[PDB]
Design a protein around this nucleic acid. Structure first.
Lengths: 57, 57
DNA sequence: CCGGAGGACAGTCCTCCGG
DNA sequence: CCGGAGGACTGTCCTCCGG
């Protein structure tokens, strides 16, 4: 499912074949399929927490 | 057709029948269907705008 | 090139059961 | 009194379309 970094960067269709996907292979570009990087919980708790820690001070 | 506030904080079934749902008619209580609580948007930019604006204090 | 559909999915948001 | 289950809804987050 996870398209590579470069087709990601590019908003294109990845073929998804590890080691180097079709376009990287053929273009001798680095095929890195990087991890999905973690964000903050987008939870009503964490929004009103932090929008009220801020507006308080 | 939304529950009234007494049944609401008592977590009871409402008949939602305006102006007086059955329990407040039967029981002679003030019935109020106070309106849609507006909140801030649990969207990503607003979470981020705000923790950035707190990380900046 | 890159905004946006398309959509599966996460976490809300109210309600009322049943202990 | 209330924990949290059930369900519609809201917005996400990912990918790849299509001008």
């Amino acid at each position: 499912e996870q398209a590579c970094d470069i087709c990601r960067l590019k908003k294109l269709k990845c073929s998804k074949e590890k080691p180097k996907c079709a376009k990287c292979l053929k273009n001798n570009w680095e095929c890195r399929y990087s991890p999905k990087t973690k964000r903050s919980p987008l939870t009503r708790a964490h929004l009103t927490e932090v929008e009220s820690r801020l507006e308080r001070l």
